From a paper:
Protein type III secretion systems (T3SSs) are organic nanosyringes that achieve an energy-dependent translocation of bacterial proteins through the two membranes of Gram-negative organisms. InvA is a member of a set of several inner membrane proteins that form this core of the T3SS. Highly conserved across pathogenic bacteria, as well as with a conserved homolog in the flagellar system (FlhA), InvA is critical to the functioning of the T3SS. InvA of S. typhimurium is 685 amino acids in length and the N-terminal 300 amino acids are comprised of seven transmembrane helices.
To begin to address some of these outstanding questions, we determined the crystal structure of a C-terminal fragment of InvA to 1.9 Å resolution. The construct 356–525 produced crystals that diffracted well and allowed the high-resolution structural determination of roughly half of the InvA cytoplasmic domain. The biological significance of this dimer is uncertain, as the protein migrates as a monomeric species on size-exclusion chromatography and the buried surface area of this interaction is less than 500 Å2. The two copies of the protein are very similar, with a root-mean-square deviation in Cα positions of 0.8 Å. Two regions of the protein contribute most to this variation: the C-terminal helix of the truncated construct and an extended region of 30 amino acids spanning residues 370–400. In this latter extended region, covering two helices and a loop, there are overall small translational shifts in the helices in the alignment and in once place, involving residues 390–399, the long loop between H2 and β2 adopts very different conformations, both of which are well ordered in the electron-density maps. Interestingly, the first InvA subdomain (residues 358–417) also has a core with two α-helices and a three-stranded β-­sheet, two strands of which are parallel. The folds are distinct, however, in their topology, with one domain having a βαββα fold (strand–helix–strand–strand–helix) and the other having an αββαβ fold (helix–strand–strand–helix–strand). The second InvA subdomain falls into the former class.
Author numbering: 358 to 523
Write the structure that this text describes.
């Protein structure tokens, strides 16, 4: 890989993320989990970028925008019982999926009650790995479709007749 991954980050978080060595954390973890070598990961200030937002660019094209609450912890196996403990999560919603976040102090209480918590940087890594994995799956899917159009012996009218039937 010769083209770097770029993460646009909030201007107020950039120096903390550099001090936390986010780039090396990401590169190191991805290699251990997958055996694949990420290109260099560069952080850049995102103009107008609100807090808790990260934009992934590859080859200067926007790939995905993540919502990660830098000062909070993600409740990985969140259940509604959390609320019965007096803890009301920060909820982020992306499509059909909800993500539940709590304070560091709340996180420590939930860890004693069977919950698993991920800090923001670990969740940011997780978001990247999920995005990278989703894109690879779809790429393979495109290839499967090309193979089916190669193997296809039925013509279009006959093919479309069969589809409406079933």
């Amino acid at each position: 890989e010769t083209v770097p991954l770029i993460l646009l980050v909030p201007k107020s978080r950039r120096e903390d993320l550099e001090k936390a060595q986010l780039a090396e954390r990401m590169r190191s973890q991805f290699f251990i989990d997958y055996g694949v070598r990420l290109p260099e990961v560069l952080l850049r200030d995102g103009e107008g970028l609100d807090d808790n937002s990260i934009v992934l660019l590859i080859n200067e094209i926007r790939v995905e925008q993540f919502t990660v609450y830098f000062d909070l912890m993600r409740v990985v196996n969140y259940s509604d019982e959390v609320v019965s403990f007096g803890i009301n999560p920060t909820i982020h919603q992306q499509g059909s999926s909800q993500y539940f976040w709590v304070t560091h102090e709340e996180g420590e209480k939930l860890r004693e009650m069977g919950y698993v918590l991920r800090n923001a940087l670990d969740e940011l890594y997780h978001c990247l790995a999920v995005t990278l994995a989703r894109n690879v799956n779809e790429y393979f899917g495109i290839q499967e479709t090309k193979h089916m159009l190669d193997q296809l012996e039925a013509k279009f009218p006959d093919l479309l007749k069969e589809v409406l039937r079933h």
